[PDB]
């Protein structure tokens, strides 16, 4: 489809956690979602939150419809469960790597299904738990998912990093290595 | 693997040259099984699983009336709002050149994604030796891109990476002397 811009509400429900998600993306970047637990709209940037609003009940009402529709399709499909599609993983820094200068490492996990995933940052074999963040499970036009994980870090010639990824389509956890080279 | 069933929905608005096209997609696992496309004007079953749903939805006049109105009532409305904010987002690229033989023009933290990055050697544009990544989406409403030039340095050569972007008054350049 020809388009200068694509604006998409994307939502899903499923048996396992996360059991629901309701978000809006503009040109493939997530602009807001509805936190279904807190029943509140969450804007990605302050630029958006100050200008825009969205009634969270609109997200909750749509998720209720999807959950009903999921129950129907489980019956109509004779409980068809899809094959697991394992993720592709890439790790790259946000800024040019300068030893001793603060940076952000990004782990992009792509082309996987279902949207059930465990991700851990490792540094020299050990989990890093501070200075981390992550995206939602983001939609793809082929109905698989992708996701971003972030780690604040100070680059150093020594350190080896891993983005360790767990998914049902994998024979064992996937460790994608990165070093400042 | 554990027992797991997934259902997805999408409501997509395609803005192009003043027009709005609306698709609403119903997906079981990864099988799109029914959809409404405003170019089409009614629901269609995408697979056999969608035949009951398309038939039923297409029999409800109020639903068709609502969906046929979405381009003008929902898509155009939200697009006008995004014209006031999202489409005015401008984050200026940072530019760094470093050697790797390649010279790397690393352009970071910019928005929107459309950008032109060109290499010049002694004032002459160099294209045949340019290996570019794709645009890299960072997921945080910024992009980056690495535009690398295959190079054979010789003393005196002056390389310049020039970046053009809607956020800039004028193109920005970084020079590297061999």
């Amino acid at each position: 489809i020809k388009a200068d811009h694509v604006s998409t509400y994307a939502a899903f429900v499923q048996t396992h956690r996360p059991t629901g998600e309701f978000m809006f993306e503009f040109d493939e970047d997530e602009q807001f979602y509805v936190d279904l637990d807190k029943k509140e709209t969450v804007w990605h940037l302050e630029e958006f939150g100050r200008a825009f609003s969205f009634e969270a009940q609109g997200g909750l009402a749509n998720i209720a419809i999807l959950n009903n529709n999921l129950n129907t399709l489980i019956q109509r499909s004779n409980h068809t469960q899809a094959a697991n599609d394992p993720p592709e993983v890439t790790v790259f820094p946000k800024e040019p790597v300068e030893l001793g200068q603060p940076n952000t490492l990004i782990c992009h996990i792509d082309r996987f299904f279902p949207p059930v995933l465990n991700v851990t940052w490792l540094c020299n074999g050990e989990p890093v738990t501070e200075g981390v963040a992550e995206s939602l499970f983001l939609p793809r036009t082929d109905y698989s998912f992708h996701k971003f994980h972030y780690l604040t870090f100070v680059p150093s010639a020594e350190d080896v990093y891993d983005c360790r990824v767990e998914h049902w389509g994998l024979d064992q956890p996937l460790l994608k290595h990165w070093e400042a080279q | 693997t554990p027992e797991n069933y997934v259902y997805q929905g999408r409501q997509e608005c395609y803005a192009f040259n003043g027009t709005q096209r609306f698709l609403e997609r119903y997906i079981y696992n990864r099988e799109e099984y029914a959809r409404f496309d405003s170019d089409v004007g009614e629901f269609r079953a995408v697979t056999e699983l969608g035949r009951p749903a398309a038939e039923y939805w297409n029999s409800q006049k109020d639903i068709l009336e609502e969906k046929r109105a979405v381009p003008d009532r929902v898509c155009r409305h939200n697009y006008e709002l995004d014209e006031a904010v999202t489409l005015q987002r401008r984050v200026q690229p940072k530019v760094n050149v470093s050697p790797s033989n390649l010279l790397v023009c690393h352009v970071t933290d910019f928005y929107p994604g459309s950008i032109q990055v060109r290499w010049f050697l002694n004032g002459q544009e160099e294209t045949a030796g340019v290996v570019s990544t794709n645009l890299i989406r960072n997921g945080d409403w910024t992009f980056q891109i690495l535009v690398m030039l295959e190079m054979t340095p010789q003393q005196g050569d002056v390389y310049i990476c020039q970046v053009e972007h809607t956020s800039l008054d004028s193109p920005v350049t970084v020079e590297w002397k061999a």
Binding site: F54, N69 | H77
Partner: peptide
């Protein structure tokens, strides 16, 4: 209100 974005309403399956 701020500038309010509009939702679409997903349709209920026939069960």
């Amino acid at each position: 209100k701020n500038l309010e974005k509009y939702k679409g309403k997903f349709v209920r399956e026939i069960d």
